Structures are given as C-alpha cells and as structure tokens.
C-alpha cells in the first residue's frame, strides 16, 4: 500500500465531495464565446417584454413596461414630465439577463418614466400608550405621496 493511503470508510472521507473546475485558459475562451453569441442576440433584438430592477429612493423596485410605482414623498417634478431613472442593477430578456457589478454602465441601459400624480397618504393613527390614555391623545401622519408610470426601457449592443 502506498504511503499516505487511507482505506475509505464512514469517517475516512469527508461527507462533501470534491469537484474539479475547468482550466482557466480554455474557460476564458468560453467566457468570451458566450459574450460574442449574446452580443449577436442583443444586436438581433430577439426579445419582447423586458424586466429591470431599479433602485429609487431607499427601495429597490423590479420594473416592467406599464408598471406603476408610488413614492411617499415630493419629487419637485411636474406631472406628465418624463424622467430617467439612473440606478439600474439588473435587466432581463426572454432567454438572457444582465447583472451589474454592482451596476451596469450608463451606456448599456436607458430607462425613462413619467410622473402621474402628486398626493398624500390616508390618515395613520399615532395613539400613545400612557396611563389615562384619554380620547384626545393621538396624532395623524398623512404623509405626502407621488405616482410614477414606467414608460420605456432602452438597450444597445455595447458589450
């Protein structure tokens, strides 16, 4: 028996099974090959509806055409004016998707939406838990609000 030989048993081998990654040099060629084919797919425009993840305010919104998003604050923009969202981290197609690291280049993706309405919120109770609470010890919030309608998503083969 060769040196450093251990017969296989319940405790001799780890429960996990080792795996072997492909060699880097050929692996990069596949990475380049995948990009070239996908670049042709983008050039051919072989996609219909698309979904994109856009971060606005303090929240991340997964977005698609015709989507309506509500932001609970003023934006200083008149209604009916198209605006461009500048924070997109993910865009998807029927048979392919693109992921930012952590964001895509501005050239690749352009997203535009329009302001629909500026409003406030319905009353929100703010009662307090104090001995002898009383019936006239409460507050209302009615925070401001705004409405946005997604308009278009634009991409180009700029890989």
């Amino acid at each position: 028996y060769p040196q450093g030989y251990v017969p296989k048993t319940s405790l001799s081998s780890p429960p996990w099974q080792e795996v072997v990654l492909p060699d880097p040099v050929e692996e990069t060629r596949h990475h380049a090959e995948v990009v070239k084919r996908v670049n042709e797919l983008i050039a051919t425009g072989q996609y219909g509806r698309l979904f994109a993840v856009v971060h606005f305010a303090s929240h991340q919104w997964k977005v698609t055409a015709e989507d309506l998003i509500l932001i609970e604050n003023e934006l200083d923009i008149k209604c009916g004016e198209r605006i461009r969202l500048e924070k997109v981290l993910l865009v998807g197609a029927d048979n392919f998707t693109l992921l930012g690291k952590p964001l895509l280049r501005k050239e690749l993706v352009r997203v535009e939406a329009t302001v629909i309405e500026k409003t406030e919120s319905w009353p929100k109770i703010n009662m307090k838990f104090r001995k002898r609470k009383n019936f006239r010890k409460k507050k209302i919030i009615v925070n401001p609000q705004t409405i946005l309608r997604i308009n278009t998503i634009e991409i180009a083969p700029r890989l």
Binding site: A57, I83, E86, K87, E112
Partner: protein
C-alpha cells in the same frame, strides 16, 4: 449580513454606507438636465466638510504643540549659554 467580508475588501460593511450607490444621484431629467443634489447627500456632504476643516485645524494646532516645544527648548538652551562683559 456579509459586513465582515465587505470590510476585508475595504468596502463599507453595510451596503447602505459610503458608496456610489447611495451617494450618486438616483435620476436625471429626460432632456438631460442634471438633477438637483439630494438633500440627504447635501446634509451628509456638509458634515464631512465640517470634519475635514476640523482635522486640518487640529493638525495645525498639533504642529504648533510640538514645534513650540522646540522653540521653548531653544529658549531654555540659549538661556543656559549666557555671558556678559
């Protein structure tokens, strides 16, 4: 989660901390007009500017704090070596 790994790479432990994602503007006009600076970003910017001025002032005061010691030693040194007539 993941704060420890982010610190190892030198980034902020919380993704919501110091980073282009939070700092950069979140939108721009379709016409191309730049969006107004964010109120939160401006408020955060002001604090950093105030701290920077304090840091420079402290170091300037610190430089004198040690440099002056050398000027008081020169006065002590010259005082020891004295003569007349």
């Amino acid at each position: 989660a993941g704060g420890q790994w982010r610190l190892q790479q030198g980034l902020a432990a919380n993704p919501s901390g110091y980073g282009p994602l939070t700092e950069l503007p979140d939108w721009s006009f379709a016409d191309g007009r730049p969006a107004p600076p964010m109120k939160g970003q401006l408020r955060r910017k002001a604090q950093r500017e105030k701290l920077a001025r304090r840091v420079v002032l402290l170091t300037q005061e610190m430089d004198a704090g040690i440099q002056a010691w050398k000027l008081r030693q020169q006065k002590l040194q010259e005082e020891r070596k004295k003569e007349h007539d």
